[PDB]
Design an enzyme around this catalytic site. Structure first.
Site, short mmCIF file in Angstrom:
data_model
loop_
_atom_site.label_atom_id
_atom_site.label_comp_id
_atom_site.label_asym_id
_atom_site.label_seq_id
_atom_site.Cartn_x
_atom_site.Cartn_y
_atom_site.Cartn_z
N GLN A 35 -65.26 -93.50 55.00
CA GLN A 35 -64.61 -94.06 56.09
C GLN A 35 -63.20 -93.92 56.31
OE1 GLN A 35 -64.77 -98.15 54.83
NE2 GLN A 35 -63.45 -97.84 53.15
N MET A 39 -59.03 -90.50 51.95
CA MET A 39 -59.75 -90.88 50.73
C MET A 39 -60.42 -89.81 50.09
SD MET A 39 -58.77 -93.77 49.34
CE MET A 39 -59.68 -94.46 48.25
N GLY A 42 -61.68 -89.67 46.75
CA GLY A 42 -62.00 -90.84 46.04
C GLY A 42 -60.54 -91.61 45.69
N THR A 43 -60.56 -92.74 44.86
CA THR A 43 -59.39 -93.34 44.52
C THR A 43 -58.54 -92.73 43.34
OG1 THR A 43 -60.38 -95.59 45.00
CG2 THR A 43 -58.80 -95.40 43.08
N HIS A 428 -49.68 -77.68 13.04
CA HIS A 428 -48.38 -78.10 12.65
C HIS A 428 -47.26 -77.38 13.50
CE1 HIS A 428 -45.53 -79.46 9.56
NE2 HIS A 428 -45.04 -78.07 9.70
C1 LIG Z 1 -53.36 -97.84 40.27
C2 LIG Z 1 -54.58 -97.32 39.79
C3 LIG Z 1 -54.47 -96.48 38.18
C4 LIG Z 1 -55.61 -96.11 37.90
N1 LIG Z 1 -55.39 -95.24 36.56
C5 LIG Z 1 -56.57 -95.07 36.08
C6 LIG Z 1 -56.58 -93.96 34.84
O1 LIG Z 1 -55.36 -93.81 34.45
N2 LIG Z 1 -57.75 -93.81 34.20
C7 LIG Z 1 -58.90 -94.01 34.81
O2 LIG Z 1 -59.87 -93.63 34.02
N3 LIG Z 1 -59.21 -95.03 35.93
C8 LIG Z 1 -57.93 -95.11 36.32
N4 LIG Z 1 -58.07 -96.29 37.57
C9 LIG Z 1 -59.31 -96.52 37.91
C10 LIG Z 1 -60.15 -95.35 38.89
O3 LIG Z 1 -59.28 -94.80 39.89
C11 LIG Z 1 -61.39 -95.82 39.44
O4 LIG Z 1 -62.15 -96.80 38.47
C12 LIG Z 1 -62.30 -95.06 39.72
O5 LIG Z 1 -61.34 -93.95 40.59
C13 LIG Z 1 -63.44 -95.49 40.71
O6 LIG Z 1 -64.03 -94.26 41.49
P1 LIG Z 1 -65.40 -94.65 42.25
O7 LIG Z 1 -66.52 -93.39 42.10
O8 LIG Z 1 -65.98 -95.91 41.69
O9 LIG Z 1 -65.17 -94.90 43.59
P2 LIG Z 1 -63.66 -94.58 44.48
O10 LIG Z 1 -63.02 -93.32 43.83
O11 LIG Z 1 -62.92 -95.75 44.32
O12 LIG Z 1 -64.31 -94.07 45.77
C14 LIG Z 1 -64.91 -95.02 46.74
C15 LIG Z 1 -64.92 -94.49 48.24
O13 LIG Z 1 -65.81 -95.25 49.08
C16 LIG Z 1 -65.18 -95.29 50.25
N5 LIG Z 1 -65.76 -96.35 50.94
C17 LIG Z 1 -65.75 -97.64 50.69
N6 LIG Z 1 -66.55 -98.34 51.32
C18 LIG Z 1 -66.91 -97.44 52.44
C19 LIG Z 1 -67.97 -97.58 53.45
N7 LIG Z 1 -68.54 -98.57 53.81
N8 LIG Z 1 -68.26 -96.66 54.15
C20 LIG Z 1 -67.76 -95.23 53.76
N9 LIG Z 1 -66.84 -94.90 52.67
C21 LIG Z 1 -66.84 -96.16 52.07
C22 LIG Z 1 -63.60 -95.57 50.11
O14 LIG Z 1 -63.08 -95.18 50.88
C23 LIG Z 1 -63.48 -94.45 48.73
O15 LIG Z 1 -62.95 -93.51 48.92
C24 LIG Z 1 -56.92 -96.64 38.35
C25 LIG Z 1 -57.19 -97.48 39.54
C26 LIG Z 1 -55.97 -97.92 40.03
C27 LIG Z 1 -56.06 -98.62 41.36
C1 LIG Z 2 -39.05 -69.64 12.04
C2 LIG Z 2 -40.50 -70.02 11.39
C3 LIG Z 2 -41.38 -70.92 12.13
C4 LIG Z 2 -42.54 -71.37 11.76
N1 LIG Z 2 -43.27 -72.05 12.41
C5 LIG Z 2 -44.54 -72.72 11.76
C6 LIG Z 2 -45.26 -73.45 12.41
O1 LIG Z 2 -45.22 -73.89 13.91
N2 LIG Z 2 -46.42 -73.81 11.86
C7 LIG Z 2 -46.68 -73.60 10.51
O2 LIG Z 2 -48.00 -74.10 10.39
N3 LIG Z 2 -45.93 -72.73 10.05
C8 LIG Z 2 -45.05 -72.19 10.35
N4 LIG Z 2 -44.03 -71.36 9.72
C9 LIG Z 2 -44.54 -70.95 8.27
C10 LIG Z 2 -44.23 -72.00 7.12
O3 LIG Z 2 -42.86 -72.62 7.37
C11 LIG Z 2 -44.61 -71.73 5.86
O4 LIG Z 2 -45.81 -71.19 5.90
C12 LIG Z 2 -44.63 -72.84 4.78
O5 LIG Z 2 -43.46 -73.72 5.13
C13 LIG Z 2 -44.35 -72.18 3.63
O6 LIG Z 2 -44.56 -73.29 2.71
P1 LIG Z 2 -44.38 -73.25 1.05
O7 LIG Z 2 -45.25 -74.21 0.47
O8 LIG Z 2 -45.29 -71.77 0.94
O9 LIG Z 2 -43.07 -72.92 0.53
P2 LIG Z 2 -41.84 -73.07 1.00
O10 LIG Z 2 -41.62 -74.45 1.94
O11 LIG Z 2 -41.19 -71.80 1.56
O12 LIG Z 2 -40.84 -73.62 -0.19
C14 LIG Z 2 -40.54 -72.68 -1.14
C15 LIG Z 2 -39.38 -73.27 -1.95
O13 LIG Z 2 -39.27 -72.50 -3.05
C16 LIG Z 2 -37.86 -72.22 -3.38
N5 LIG Z 2 -37.54 -71.31 -4.38
C17 LIG Z 2 -37.96 -70.04 -4.34
N6 LIG Z 2 -37.80 -69.41 -5.18
C18 LIG Z 2 -37.18 -70.22 -6.22
C19 LIG Z 2 -36.88 -70.13 -7.70
N7 LIG Z 2 -36.81 -69.13 -8.28
N8 LIG Z 2 -36.48 -71.09 -8.25
C20 LIG Z 2 -36.40 -72.25 -7.53
N9 LIG Z 2 -36.65 -72.65 -6.21
C21 LIG Z 2 -37.09 -71.60 -5.52
C22 LIG Z 2 -37.40 -72.03 -1.95
O14 LIG Z 2 -35.82 -72.31 -1.92
C23 LIG Z 2 -38.06 -72.99 -0.96
O15 LIG Z 2 -37.49 -74.69 -0.92
C24 LIG Z 2 -42.95 -70.98 10.16
C25 LIG Z 2 -42.05 -70.23 9.62
C26 LIG Z 2 -40.93 -69.76 10.12
C27 LIG Z 2 -39.94 -68.72 9.24
#
Ligand SMILES: Cc1cc2nc3c(=O)[nH]c(=O)nc-3n(C[C@H](O)[C@H](O)[C@H](O)COP(=O)(O)OP(=O)(O)OC[C@H]3O[C@@H](n4cnc5c(N)ncnc54)[C@H](O)[C@@H]3O)c2cc1C
Ligand SMILES: Cc1cc2nc3c(=O)[nH]c(=O)nc-3n(C[C@H](O)[C@H](O)[C@H](O)COP(=O)(O)OP(=O)(O)OC[C@H]3O[C@@H](n4cnc5c(N)ncnc54)[C@H](O)[C@@H]3O)c2cc1C
Ligand code: NI
Ligand code: NI
Lengths: 447, 446
Positions: A35, A39, A42-43, A428
């Site tokens: 309608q 729309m 949909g909603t 991580h």
């Molecule tokens: C503010 C707000 C936030 C929301 N946030 C979320 C969210 O985060 N997550 C979530 O999952 N849901 C959310 N919802 C709910 C979600 O939007 C609705 O549950 C869902 O969109 C319903 O879809 P539907 O398929 O039932 O129909 P709708 O998508 O409502 O479509 C019905 C359509 O029929 C048309 N129509 C009606 N009567 C007639 C007619 N006689 N002749 C022709 N066309 C007609 C209308 O114009 C409309 O376009 C939210 C709703 C609102 C209001």
């Molecule tokens: C820049 C960067 C980014 C990274 N990003 C990620 C990421 O996003 N995700 C991810 O999963 N991994 C990431 N990694 C890898 C991750 O950090 C390592 O794989 C992990 O932390 C190693 O842990 P570990 O238990 O092996 O020892 P570590 O946590 O390295 O600890 C070893 C410890 O032993 C100590 N030590 C060493 N020799 C001796 C000694 N002789 N006597 C006493 N103490 C000693 C050191 O001082 C240290 O504290 C990243 C690494 C780097 C460098």
């Protein structure tokens, strides 16, 4: 009855547009009746999920009200257009720009903007997908009060309210409260009931209230609204508590099925809550007519509407095995800040059902990734069944929860015990790896 | 050893601090030897994952270089202090501030800051958890060159480089490139080989290279770096393709096991890449000595060291069923912008290993949630086995991929067919619900 189709979809909703495109891909000629050109898609696309979370997202970044509303309009316009053409450019789909009303059990009238019947169409199956609309309360003064909005109106407001008063305390109302607070508006929320988010875990809710109030949001319970009055500049919400003066008022007290379809011309029955009655295959009381999405009652989510397409596809083209009784666990997110995501039971519900359960919790401030996020707020909580080590429920209140909750949904459905999530290797540094600690516990048996 | 413990952990690393706390919880008396108070909590906390991603996160928000580095310092100090006290305050754990070196197979010398032996300790089991260190290349002029850093030095740099030249093009190098570009530094990346990220899916990498270059990052392959020379203010990186003038140079060409433990005093053997040789239970060639984390070779991730704790705990306290052969699928994330996350096989690998596979892809610009994110960049790609409809691998390049990749890891391990992820109910609007489209495809038999 004049023009015949293989399939008629009433409403450009989620289930409807997904089913229409599928049917067309099989060679069927489909009519989608919508309608309003505002729309298309949909909603979710136009007045719900997508615009609202665009504003949530941009407000968390500190973008201004003006810049956020401007980008929201661009997003909606782009997705509206792309949804329109996905259906209309298909040779097997006609997007019909009319209001639909039934002529009979087999024939749908098409109405122009003046409510006149311009044409009629028929098809062997008809899908009602008309959604829901905001509930309008019976409040003295509402019919002529200025500066009053429903969710659709507020998502298109032409100015930033300095003070927004929200009538309603449900999940959508609270989303708007955090949304507007993060854009620099003062917000007051008025709940008629005794508490906010009843049915959510009360330990989690207590943190959520604290975090809302730390934004300067005022929350009130047991509020009886009796009258609205307005100026050219302000609107006052008169209540049993107080008179709340606002620059804008949001009415967010619920959404009711849209059934303005001349159902008296049919054998289609409505339920006690105004919903179209359906069986487990989403069949109405007329067997060749189905209903999908918000209009058939129950949960109002875009992904429930999408699942309704799966059920109706299964009934009409598949093996009929999909029903409303085998959806799997249904997760959801309350998009306050940070998001509160949930699947399955609370510990209160598990205890009330006499589960031998264990609950365990983890503050987000104890998750090292929170330091990277620069956000210590939140609480993760899980409930497990001691009898089989399966997960009964989880509440993830904190950053990334709207993504993480899907891991727990999958585990529940696939009977993956909580010990697998406890012991798994996760990337991580992430929020997901907090599961190594969230699920690190032993049984606490309850007799 | 003069004093006797039930367990000795050499190094305050991930496996080691986790195992120390567990062992103490059973009533065991634990010694944890750590050579540097800047390393309480290990590499992740102090010089690796946590500081680097703090800078990544704050740079994506548009925070200044100075504001981001100051907050990084706050984060590291807080978590270093927390980690120290979690062990030191434990009644059953002594954190010993010394450099460990072996006196024999059964006792460990404790060295002061001048490498003088102060005392010695013994325990029936010893865990080597000493990590890895940056590889130092042999480049003419490096001995006297100014303004040259490894990853640790760069994460503690005292000024913002106007131009950072990175010698090396591996995953950590590229993370630093995007990190500094997002803080406003110009970055040049020098790779000696013929391509960046050669082990990743080449369709994805092509998008990743475009997105790096759209940030103004210059990328060069086939680079031989022949010399470093420096001013009081600049350093010239001399190369076969051109000379590059910079005010900071990062050397990021790998990380080697830290085995400076006087192992000649023991029967502990090293492998061909300097790693401590271990069996599948992480036992060294001395049966009561285990090695965990980077030092025993292979994948260098914090979560591999954490899983090494699980293996050693199973060996010493449990049913010993846990090994390096049943870790499950190991995901990982390259934290460029947006992150490139991976688990399992690429299409190329699946074809090479003779699978009857199907690939399918989804541009992030086709995912409606990208509009909410204000970011159209990325590509999601999956590979499935047509024999059984199981997932062979996935590459998720785009926002939230570091969380989403864990869903696919779980599905691979638990034999969940790709059709379950295709048909599932997901929250909305999210990146996760893109799985309804990413997995919506049919076999293409090979
Ligand atoms: C503010 C707000 C936030 C929301 N946030 C979320 C969210 O985060 N997550 C979530 O999952 N849901 C959310 N919802 C709910 C979600 O939007 C609705 O549950 C869902 O969109 C319903 O879809 P539907 O398929 O039932 O129909 P709708 O998508 O409502 O479509 C019905 C359509 O029929 C048309 N129509 C009606 N009567 C007639 C007619 N006689 N002749 C022709 N066309 C007609 C209308 O114009 C409309 O376009 C939210 C709703 C609102 C209001
Ligand atoms: C820049 C960067 C980014 C990274 N990003 C990620 C990421 O996003 N995700 C991810 O999963 N991994 C990431 N990694 C890898 C991750 O950090 C390592 O794989 C992990 O932390 C190693 O842990 P570990 O238990 O092996 O020892 P570590 O946590 O390295 O600890 C070893 C410890 O032993 C100590 N030590 C060493 N020799 C001796 C000694 N002789 N006597 C006493 N103490 C000693 C050191 O001082 C240290 O504290 C990243 C690494 C780097 C460098
Ligand atoms: Ni028990
Ligand atoms: Ni096949």
């Amino acid at each position: 009855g004049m023009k015949t189709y293989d399939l008629i979809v009433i409403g450009f909703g989620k289930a409807g547009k997904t089913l229409a495109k599928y049917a067309a891909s099989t060679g069927q000629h489909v009519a989608v009746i919508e309608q309003s050109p505002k729309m298309y898609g949909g909603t979710s696309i136009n007045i719900g999920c997508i615009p609202s979370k665009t504003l949530v997202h941009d407000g968390l970044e500190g973008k201004s009200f003006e810049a956020s509303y401007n980008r929201k309009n661009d997003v909606v316009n782009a997705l509206n257009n792309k949804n329109y053409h996905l259906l209309a450019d298909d040779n097997n789909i006609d997007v019909l720009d009319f209001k639909a009303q039934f002529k009979s059990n087999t024939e749908v009238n098409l109405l122009d903007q003046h409510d006149d019947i311009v044409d009629s169409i028929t098809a062997p199956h008809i899908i009602i997908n008309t959604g829901a609309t905001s509930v309008i309360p019976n409040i003295k003064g509402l019919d002529q009060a200025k500066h009053v909005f429903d969710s659709t109106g507020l998502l298109n407001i032409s100015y930033q309210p300095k003070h927004l008063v929200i009538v309603g305390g449900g999940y959508i109302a609270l989303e708007f409260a955090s949304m507007f607070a993060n854009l620099g508006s003062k917000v007051t929320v008025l709940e008629r009931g005794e508490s906010f988010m009843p049915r959510e875990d009360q330990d989690v809710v207590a943190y959520g209230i604290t975090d809302l109030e730390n934004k300067g949001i005022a929350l009130h319970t047991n509020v009886e609204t009796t009258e609205l009055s307005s100026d050219n500049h302000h609107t006052t919400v008169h209540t049993n508590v107080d008179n709340f003066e606002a620059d804008a008022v949001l009415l967010a007290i619920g959404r009711k099925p849209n059934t303005d379809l001349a159902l008296e011309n049919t054998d289609i029955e409505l339920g006690d809550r105004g919903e179209i009655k359906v069986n487990a295959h989403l069949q109405t009381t007329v067997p060749h007519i189905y209903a999908a999405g918000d209009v058939k009652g129950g949960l109002q989510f875009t992904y429930i509407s999408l699942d309704d397409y799966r059920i109706i596809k299964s009934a009409l083209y598949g093996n009929q095995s999909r029903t409303t009784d085998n959806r799997g666990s249904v997760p959801y997110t309350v998009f306050i800040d940070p998001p509160l995501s949930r699947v399955g039971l609370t510990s209160k519900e598990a205890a009330a059902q006499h589960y031998d359960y264990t609950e365990h919790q983890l503050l987000v401030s104890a998750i090292p990734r929170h330091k990277i996020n620069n956000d210590p707020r939140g609480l993760f909580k899980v409930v497990i069944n001691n009898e089989n080590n399966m997960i009964l429920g989880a509440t993830l209140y904190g950053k990334q929860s709207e993504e993480l909750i899907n891991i727990i949904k999958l585990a529940i459905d696939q009977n993956i015990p909580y010990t697998v999530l406890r012991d798994n290797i996760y990337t991580h540094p992430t929020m997901a790896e907090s599961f190594n600690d969230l699920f690190n516990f032993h049984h606490h048996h309850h007799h």
